Design a protein around this ligand. Sequence first.
Ligand SMILES: Cc1cc2nc3c(=O)[nH]c(=O)nc-3n(C[C@H](O)[C@H](O)[C@H](O)COP(=O)(O)OP(=O)(O)OC[C@H]3O[C@@H](n4cnc5c(N)ncnc54)[C@H](O)[C@@H]3O)c2cc1C
Ligand SMILES: Cc1cc2nc3c(=O)[nH]c(=O)nc-3n(C[C@H](O)[C@H](O)[C@H](O)COP(=O)(O)OP(=O)(O)OC[C@H]3O[C@@H](n4cnc5c(N)ncnc54)[C@H](O)[C@@H]3O)c2cc1C
Ligand SMILES: CC(=O)N[C@@H](C)CCNCCCCN
Ligand SMILES: CC(=O)N[C@@H](C)CCNCCCCN
Lengths: 493, 499
Amino acid sequence: SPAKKKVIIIGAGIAGLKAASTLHQNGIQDCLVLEARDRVGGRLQTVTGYQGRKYDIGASWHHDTLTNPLFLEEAQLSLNDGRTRFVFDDDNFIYIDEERGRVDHDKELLLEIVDNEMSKFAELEFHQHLGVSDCSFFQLVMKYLLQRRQFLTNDQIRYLPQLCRYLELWHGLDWKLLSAKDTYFGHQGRNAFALNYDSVVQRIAQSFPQNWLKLSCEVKSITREPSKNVTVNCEDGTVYNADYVIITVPQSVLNLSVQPEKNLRGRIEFQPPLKPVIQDAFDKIHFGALGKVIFEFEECCWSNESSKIVTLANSTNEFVEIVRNAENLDELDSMLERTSVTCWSQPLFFVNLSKSTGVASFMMLMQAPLTNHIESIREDKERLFSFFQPVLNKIMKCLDSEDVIDGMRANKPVLRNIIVSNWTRDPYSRGAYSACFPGDDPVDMVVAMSNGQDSRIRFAGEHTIMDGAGCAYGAWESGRREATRISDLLKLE
Amino acid sequence: KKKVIIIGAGIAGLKAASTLHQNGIQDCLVLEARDRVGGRLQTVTGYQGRKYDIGASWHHDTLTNPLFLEEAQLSLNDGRTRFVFDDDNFIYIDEERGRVDHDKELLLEIVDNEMSKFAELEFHQHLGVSDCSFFQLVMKYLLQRRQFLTNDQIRYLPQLCRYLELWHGLDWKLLSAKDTYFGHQGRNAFALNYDSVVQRIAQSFPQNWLKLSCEVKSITREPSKNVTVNCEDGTVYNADYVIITVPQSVLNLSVQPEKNLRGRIEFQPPLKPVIQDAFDKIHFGALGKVIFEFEECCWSNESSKIVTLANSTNEFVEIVRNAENLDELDSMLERETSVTCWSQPLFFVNLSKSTGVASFMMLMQAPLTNHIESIREDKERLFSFFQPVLNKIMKCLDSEDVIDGMRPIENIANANKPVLRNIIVSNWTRDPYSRGAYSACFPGDDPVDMVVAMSNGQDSRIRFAGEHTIMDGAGCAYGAWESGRREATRISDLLKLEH
Ligand SMILES: Cc1cc2nc3c(=O)[nH]c(=O)nc-3n(C[C@H](O)[C@H](O)[C@H](O)COP(=O)(O)OP(=O)(O)OC[C@H]3O[C@@H](n4cnc5c(N)ncnc54)[C@H](O)[C@@H]3O)c2cc1C
Ligand SMILES: Cc1cc2nc3c(=O)[nH]c(=O)nc-3n(C[C@H](O)[C@H](O)[C@H](O)COP(=O)(O)OP(=O)(O)OC[C@H]3O[C@@H](n4cnc5c(N)ncnc54)[C@H](O)[C@@H]3O)c2cc1C
Ligand SMILES: CC(=O)N[C@@H](C)CCNCCCCN
Ligand SMILES: CC(=O)N[C@@H](C)CCNCCCCN
């Protein structure tokens, strides 16, 4: 009864998609790609909004374009047919405080310059100094302010910490939840905004047998037979027999396996259960919640100086005084004690799409915990508008325009629609991507994952590889990885 | 007669002396050829008594710079201003286009950043593997990334990225690509009187220890456990330990004949091969300075950092867009006279915004440095040479063309106009006791060799200190300083524990 297959890939995100592609490319046949959702792409999804305007609600950029193999591959295609597949949208960041207004490229604040010294400080703190404890990013910044207070103006001590928090939108984690040791990463080049990441999903997906794809099939268990074989069960009752399986479900979904209770959407029952080195790796790596909110306006009626804008959370002169009077980090923490969440309670990152793509919309990024709350009320459009109205306005103000007008039903910006991500509530997602809490060793997971459950049960995905960890191109490389090792193995006869 | 003889009263030698005295050592000498102390640290006086550092000006790497931190402690204690953090957002000026910085369409700093990462990637974990010129490296980047660069970026970026010439004092075709990028260990602090740093150290040991106008002609290492030293004036001194801090450029004269040269020290026994070999894998740059003193500030103080860009051509763009490969680029370029102020990038420090003084401290590089220092007395000529770039700056800073006011003459109808009252030029490439600015690398060099060669000394008695004898702070004021404490401590302990 259990139909035989050479390779069964679980999950049709970019990793599984690339794995299948690579398998077909190497002549392997009778493979299956089982996907729980009614679409392929996974954390890569392009949704439609006001008037057919398209937006990537998952991944948007090709990072590390100097070495990104996925990007270079896309780049080659565009060189051959002159088709626009992406756009380099890095720009000079415009920073905004609720009161103080724009604070970027400020001849007195010089925030970008001290920010640079701070990252140099962090680098010096961990590089070479083996054995140093981890601590949160926040604690790292406080330590910076303490050690360099003699060389910083009050205003710098007040705003730098708020401005350097934009790093939160890289990990999807608030600075108190983020591991300092993992905060700074080396960008290997500019970023390229994909103008349709779905084009990349479709191109790869159509590079292998259509019949290979089975959507709406939720894999519920995987068993290793003593007789060198792997059995897989979709919830629709069908059973499969395969030589090799490549599991690409998100780290957060895979985590569900190391827990009792199998009736959890997305959870896979492993038999034998996942090796201790794999189960334990979950105690040393976590999941962040980067989220998105798309603001669609009728038309652009604001300044297009830049395509990158970050709103700083509120700061206070009281904070400066505390930094000035604290004897040490201990006292500083104690002194920090002196009441509800707003759009100014954390930094927010807005992509002014008008300048980069011509679309009169804003693509905003948020982080945990704000993300979990916003996505939870993503259906209440008027409440979202109420929540994001003040920063929405402050922005228009700095961009030489007027207050936003709610038009979700002449010379002012009119909000037509609001789209929200839903990655934290989606059972086949459960967050955005792998991230580190303080004390986490992302390497434990990568190692346990790339070494597999055994010669037959493998893993791929953004959380299974070092180079490009947490990125679309990393997940892509892992797919290529696992598929190639198997291709080679299958060749031997 | 003497225990330790220090050659050179630069910051290196002055620290070595300060240290030795700090460790109770006595009967030491500081033999200095110039009639002043400080070496490449010299503060001059100009119009209305304004002071400027014609030599070193900044405390680099303030996050870890030990000399700066010592200065920082002194100021936290007495509240005396000893420095001011002057890093600023750079204003870039092109003759034809004007301001090209923080441009919403050129976004030059962003590609410059990428250019920088490409450089780290090209040399990262490969082991030497063909070291080219900073210029070549930039061409490779342009060729390799043209698909993701606009025409204006390919044109202006290479000109902007050349501010790095002002960090080595070397034109991009003479400069080693492998060494071009440094590790800016935090912000820079403009020393408001490096002469204060020099004076403090000079006055921290017996004043009778210092001997100015002493040109050491030769150092003799008598196998009978002792070192012989004699200045050009005939006097002879004897010491168990000798700390040589003459600059690398001066020291390099020893490994060459004709011991007639000024400042050259004849070594007997000669400097071992390891030492002499070092000079083949390291060189000297020529960072220079020109101070333009104005009556008063009448320009916008938006920034204290201003860089004028060398001219560029769309012609250059076209070649990049057409080159089939690297070798072809070289030809199309090698086939693509008169030096002017627009022939290279010039770095202008606007002192008005940082120190309140109506002057510009301009930095220049080789090959330009020697030419300008050569005419340092021809004020009129100096003015006609920089005039156009000076007006381009004033225009961009919402002001007017400069008026030559160096010769005592007055006119009332000139208050909203910048008035040049004086020009001061450095002279390091022509000073026989410095012969350049500091250690630098031509493509193919390897600084470590000299650092090792120097740090391990000629032997247990003849040692070396100076900006070129250390890794951390190489070519910097704190590097030489530390090298001084180094040789000092070592020699100090080899005497204290004795008896
Ligand atoms: C909001 C957001 C923004 C981001 N921005 C960027 C960016 O700009 N640049 C970048 O490079 N990366 C970005 N990322 C990360 C990037 O999207 C991921 O690294 C990438 O999508 C991971 O692909 P994957 O194949 O590893 O996992 P996935 O895309 O999650 O694929 C795994 C598949 O497994 C399926 N599945 C789960 N459980 C089962 C089951 N039991 N049975 C069958 N199928 C199942 C899931 O439905 C999913 O389709 C972002 C991510 C998010 C969420
Ligand atoms: C234009 C310029 C700008 C610079 N800017 C900076 C900066 O901003 N920040 C920074 O950290 N560094 C800067 N530097 C570098 C810094 O000036 C040097 O690294 C430092 O001054 C070197 O000190 P030293 O003791 O090693 O050598 P020196 O200062 O050259 O001292 C060596 C001494 O040896 C003496 N001497 C030579 N021959 C003999 C002889 N035969 N007998 C007796 N005495 C002799 C010389 O007169 C000299 O006084 C700059 C240098 C220059 C030239
Ligand atoms: C590793 C990490 O923190 N992030 C990777 C996985 C993707 C970040 N890119 C998403 C765009 C957010 C804007 N910085
Ligand atoms: C030996 C070495 O590579 N160091 C020299 C070339 C760099 C010195 N940098 C100090 C110059 C600061 C003034 N712009």
